[PDB]
Design a binder for this molecule. Sequence first.
Ligand SMILES: O=C(O)CCCCCN1C(=O)[C@@H]2[C@H](C1=O)[C@]1(Cl)C(Cl)=C(Cl)[C@@]2(Cl)C1(Cl)Cl
Length: 178
Amino acid sequence: STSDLIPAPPLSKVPLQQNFQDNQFHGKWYVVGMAGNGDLREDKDPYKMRATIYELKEDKSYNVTWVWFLPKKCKYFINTFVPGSQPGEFTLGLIKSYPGQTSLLVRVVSTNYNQHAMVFFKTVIQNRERFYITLYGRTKELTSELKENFIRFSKSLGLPENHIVFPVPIDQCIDGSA
Ligand SMILES: O=C(O)CCCCCN1C(=O)[C@@H]2[C@H](C1=O)[C@]1(Cl)C(Cl)=C(Cl)[C@@]2(Cl)C1(Cl)Cl
């Protein structure tokens, strides 16, 4: 009897990592966990994304490279994060590799820079809000405790168990010389 989208939370339910350090968040992060407000039987493209490179520029924006894994190829996207109202928050810049749309809000919820990062993303598609939570590692694995913490936060925003997945780590696309 499903719904197509879990309603977007009030941004008062999405905290920001205190004392955000832009230079310490720079570099490569691997996807350990991903959750979203779409039915995973329909919403397939976001779950192809298995790594991100965040390159801090002199102007305090990030040049952001997204790596997708497909069974017989890699795909890559580049877009620009402009610093928002508060350290750890960002909006979309107009430099990007795809013509499609203009709207992204980003909030870094928790990070210790050398181990884990948990990031909230919200976009508007066809007049309605889509939202995702990514759990990143500096390596391809994290502890039981940190993965359990991400499940608890995902559930606090109204996502059920079957909207939360931990992909099998891979070698294709996300290594290389990147
Ligand atoms: O081609 C288009 O219109 C959109 C292609 C996606 C732009 C690049 N990009 C992104 O901007 C991000 C991640 C990403 O890959 C991912 Cl998984 C997707 Cl899809 C989007 Cl949109 C987000 Cl916000 C998320 Cl984290 Cl959900």
